């Protein structure tokens, strides 16, 4: 599923991401835009053999089991395919564990490079929130 900007904003808010660990809703929408272009089916291979899955491009190295990242962890206790569903529950719940890990949203390379220190509020402008 490819979400609309305000559609994803509303879903993320409903799932309790707005101001989660102090990160406003705009930060999460911005991260999703640059990680996956709002596409739940997005996948990208990393150099180390791991893969990033879903709207927030969650890594099989630590967070999910994709059956092909030998020696990795499954800290969110899910198959990586759950992260590709049209329902974003699994992605949001795993993202909450990631952002709590100690580095905050810096865990997302795209957020650090493209969202951090910018007017992230613009990502929710015009939406019926
Ligand atoms: O959900 N369309 O902005
Ligand atoms: O949720 N406004 O960044
Ligand atoms: O991602 N464990 O193969
Ligand atoms: O739960 N909204 O994908």
Swiss-Prot record:
Q: Which chemical reaction does it catalyze?
A: Hydrolysis of (1->4)-beta-linkages between N-acetylmuramic acid and N-acetyl-D-glucosamine residues in a peptidoglycan and between N-acetyl-D-glucosamine residues in chitodextrins
Q: What molecular function terms (GO) are annotated for this protein?
A: beta-N-acetylglucosaminidase activity; identical protein binding; lysozyme activity
Note whether Signal occurs among the keywords: yes
**InterPro entries cross-referenced by the UniProt entry:** Glyco_hydro_22, Glyco_hydro_22_CS, Glyco_hydro_22_lys, Lysozyme-like_dom_sf
SUPFAM superfamilies of this UniProt entry?
Lysozyme-like
List residues traversing the bilayer. none
Q: In which tissues is it expressed?
A: In the egg white and polymorphonuclear leukocytes.
What are the annotated disulfide bridges?
6-127, 30-115, 64-80, 76-94
Q: What is its EC number?
A: 3.2.1.17
UniProt superkingdom: Eukaryota
Q: Where is substrate annotated to bind?
A: 101
Enumerate the spans annotated as C-type lysozyme domain. 1-129
The places in or outside the cell where this protein is found are: Secreted
Arranged from A to Z, the UniProt key words for this protein are: Allergen, Antimicrobial, Bacteriolytic enzyme, Disulfide bond, Glycosidase, Hydrolase, Secreted, Signal
Q: Subunit composition?
A: Monomer.
- Record-linked PANTHER family: LYSOZYME C
Stated family: Belongs to the glycosyl hydrolase 22 family.
* Name used for this protein in its record: Lysozyme C
